[model samples]
Target: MINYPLASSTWDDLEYKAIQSVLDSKMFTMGEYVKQYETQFAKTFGSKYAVMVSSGSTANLLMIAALFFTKKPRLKKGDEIIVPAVSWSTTYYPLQQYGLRVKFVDIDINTLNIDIESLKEAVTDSTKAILTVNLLGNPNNFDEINKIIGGRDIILLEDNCESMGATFNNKCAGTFGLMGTFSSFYSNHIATMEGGCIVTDDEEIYHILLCIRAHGWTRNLPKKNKVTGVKSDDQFEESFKFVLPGYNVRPLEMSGAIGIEQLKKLPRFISVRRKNAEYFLDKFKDHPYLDVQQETGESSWFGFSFIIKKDSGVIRKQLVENLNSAGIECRPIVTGNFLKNTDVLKYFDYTVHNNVDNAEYLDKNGLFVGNHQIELFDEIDYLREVLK
Candidate 1:
């Protein structure tokens, strides 16, 4: 066995040193480090504000929750939201939890992205927003997506956990929408151990997210007119004012501290990961037995997906077995056609639009291998051998 794992540590002494500073401070909850990281992240992504949260799942929850608080165009209990059928479970679960009607759309098997035509077909008068997931670091076609919803008042929110450094036309992946979610979990673009953030240009949404992130308290919020009412002169009376039914998903100081260091390394990390993908794509593109994910834009290349072709007489089970036996880590593409799961469908008020045909196909046929920050040229050549 060559001993490849789904995730390998990317941290060095810089992360250690940053964490040591947090340890020295002795204040572990959301604090200065988290604030600093949020600032840096906002600046890097060219968004006006960023809020750090405990995990990517929490980040998604906060963004969904934010839409409900928008006074001008609030997302009410029964509003419809469109989502791609292929993404991590968290992307859809939050909508289900919030009592929103979800419309699942099929994906384009070539790009492994939301089928724009399906998305256009799914939009109805009841649709209030589109939750776009940039799957596996490949960006969706934002121009076409924008054109689809341009005349309408429908909002755009991106789930960018897999594509932190990814860009479409020069704009960052997450920044294309009104608001976007990011993750820095163990296997993500930048591993802060476990962390996430939500970015936006709207100050009102930014403030509301602050309140939601910290148990709906007014302590973290600025003194202004919000759902919590006007600012009070008495500081002591401000601690227990509960406005929104928010959860305690505060991020750790160490995660924020380490994030600051990790953020510095992303340029190099993305560069190397892209190089690996380029090399792999050259070798794997149009292979006899399978097809690979087609890049829609400048992808960060989270992992290399292999979609086995039934027409070529290739079997997905046999392909995975050979890769596993040869010591290459692999898994099904993110929760694969999430709608197929009975547990997922049971909890949500969702309907399939037209049909989730391509998503269902990918669910059975597609699997992906790891894309490391370090050079994998030799390992990839070995992968070619394993497949043969």
Candidate 2:
């Protein structure tokens, strides 16, 4: 019964051909295609290095894991990391998995990003890093965030899974932090079946991520690498030599080949999505009962969010029924007020940084519809008609 679902594939014959080539080669593990994709991805995003992983969730896992083995100023167990209370589940899982303490922060009701003021107030001497999320394809205000840190040693990391093509001040979103994570799930900006990547400018961190992506070993590493200091020249000894405790999260070669082709189409994909956003913003800007997400920078406009105003005499149940009857599919604004997941909180060493009223408000009142890499003018018009 859904006419406008959340997402659709952007793949074409190019992707299919890429997969066919991989099948013909019979070298389907993380091989030439993944390496080639990593190189192209780094060049495309202007990052010095890109390491492909199994999924965006695993990218976060490896990013956090690599941090534990970084240089002297690395993140130690129990170090506090601040995070916005409105993102997908994986954004917070890696922090807990790595034994880091979490501080949940509120988000700006307008931009649907971390509230700069809240972040300013939340940073303490113990806050070692700020793992920020650019929710719904909108970039966070990095300038303000940089000012907030102001000469502090605190690290800035980005969960850019939802904001792949977003930018602030002409710089890419994921490149703003020490390392940024991206996803290529079917519903995400690009579709490589199921894939993810981590990009960084630091070679050492890049090397570290490489080690963590595969089984903890020196086989995949260079003869001289930052992680294990120096790999054994003897290939046999190096093949099974464990360096750090790591996981097997390497991406498939087919995913890499698919990603290569998909990257070629990203510009057009983002163009159409942005075009859709313009229409959505124009139509919903003055809606009496709903508040739309405010743009922070050049958002990829992953979806269109609508938060019903308080006391607007608009019942959510009726509104949802209307949308469903009209064949429109919608969902909550991410995991809204993630702290409310007490069941999951039991596993985290966490605290509430400040009141997350805005996040709570979004949890109760916010819903979002899909945006696609194709024109949605007619579907959007239908949405307006249903709302009216």
Candidate 3:
């Protein structure tokens, strides 16, 4: 509306200087800036390795691509992938493109994340992995998820593209699984303008991602890897070596430079976002018609969610209109019941277990508005006044 915008740029002189430094030097492809950023990113999240890429979408593709290796693979040709019914489109696309069986489970309405009970019931003998999205900045209950996969051979992957700065039990959201992904787009908590990365502690997975990130070349790999040793007699000989079948998903030097500055801003970025969300929760905690996303631990508060209560007799269409008329911009919860999209039927093979009742409810009743990286106290109050 008049006071609230869907998103606004968070950059100032710092990001500009970072990019300007890159421009001063004519070279623009991946370089030293990207290396430093990756190293710094790993340290911040306490991950052993962080591989930078062009976008979060590409990060997901690479994460899945790394599993296709001939040795020590995390996935085979045809295995089951468990996913929550509600999340961004890219979360499911990688699995579809990889020819894996995508099993859709309903969400916990309160958390707008994977339902622990539904996840338990969906596992079967063919289950190879469970890919969980920390929906709308809220982390899943990892404690319970660990119990579910404790004795299984299944690998875990986190599509944390949206919930970058969130945490579960004091640990960051994107660092929990075997591998976790993140994005740094304009609206995301940390804005690199456009870029993404994947973090993992597994040395093998990290090495694989390094190769797959740059047309499957060994140039990005260290002096030694599982395939090649540290000793190289000829410099030109090793430059042309290809290891894994991979893609060119490298981020430009400009993105890396901007990201370096952006990373430093995350603490403040998340701090303000969290404060805005907490205040929003306090005001609307018992609203008659609107139910917000429940925080599992500490969410980055990417955006503020509102679910229309069926019994309240509130029409989502009109509720959205009222919000806009009051000067606040709004959007639907990300690809609600993503399988509900018709194009998915033609693209991949998937199955839905039982009823995705909560997911369906979200598809019909959910809408969200932005929570900026600065204080939105007045805007939030305006939002509450309109809701009341």
Candidate 4:
């Protein structure tokens, strides 16, 4: 019996070796390996700084938390941030956690990313920032998004957790913003078992994020004695100042070690995933019942989303069940149309921009299958046959 999972773990023996090295070190808190991973990751993405955290959700929290802690243009409670309607729950949760109002904009069915037109309409005087997400490995049109924010004093943050290897107009997906986040969860582009990171060019934001990730203590403070209002000949004495309100979000040493190995394999993983997507796209290109999500520029091809066209007479539920019974795993695309989740309504006030019809359409008719780094021709053929 061949059961095709939506996503299979891609780690090889090297990953295990990396994990063993961490265990052998016997110093397994956020130590040297975490710093090495951060340095290597920043270099890989051409970013000035990278802060590794426990999970991608914490990474997002750090990004928003940095805004409140920094000296430049801090976001206050009740400030507004524009985000897409279709994204993981954490993308908006941090905003609500910080008492910021969230405005949900619809997404483009073609790219399955935020609809720029809807974002433009959602902006108001209270809109402090825009947290744009690259869904399913496809980068959004940041060029146009920047144009929209022109002369408007709006900060741009990217939730590039799903699109780590993706680029648009030759720029990395997460680098175009003031701060960006990446996830290395089990099913993401890279798997660090369970970890995430925040990348940014701002020195102050970096410092604040570092402190916040570890109980907001001053232990990591650079000038240890400077905060005591005493001149210290030895700088190590300045490390005990409690500077900011923070949380303990640091990753395990093993995650950092595994992440280093995973980062090295990302380029190849991305290539294979893209190739697999192309094959899948070709397979369903002309199917009457299938409406494949379109790609723009370069995509890391995290997964393949299929929407059952309204005109197709087949029920989406029936189709999904049929595919599953045939041994192909499938799932809704990232908690589809997140507004339908009751928790969102409790936190912020929002109006559904442009009706969210397309998002709703996806919620009803869409489901995604995994696009593993390794190709499975037999699984693909079986999927097509079952859908037929």
Model 3 error, position 213 (Å): 0.8
Looking at model 1, residue 104 earns an lDDT score of 87
Tell me the lDDT of candidate 2: 0.91
Candidate 3's residue-wise lDDT over 116-201, tens digit each?
99898888888899999998899999989988887888888899988988989989998889899999988888888789999999
Q: Assess candidate 1 and give its TM-score to the true structure.
A: 0.98
lDDT of candidates 1 onward, in order: 0.89, 0.91, 0.88, 0.85
Best by lDDT: 2
Candidate 2 lDDT, 276-388, residue by residue in tens? 99999898888989999999989998899999999998877787888989889888888988989999999999999779999999988888999999999989988988887
Using all chains and alpha carbons, the TM-scores for the candidates as numbered come to: 0.98, 0.98, 0.97, 0.95
Q: Arrange candidates by lDDT, highest first: which order?
A: 2, 1, 3, 4
Q: What is the C-alpha RMSD of each candidate to the true structure, in Å?
A: 1.2, 1.1, 1.3, 2.2
**What is residue 297's positional error in candidate 3, in angstroms?**
0.9
217 Cα displacement, candidate 1 (Å): 0.8
Clashing pairs in 3: 1-327, 1-328, 1-329, 2-327
TM-score, model 4 to reference: 0.95
**Candidate 3 runs further than 4 Å off:** 229-231
Candidate 1 regions with alpha-carbon error over 4 angstroms:
225-229
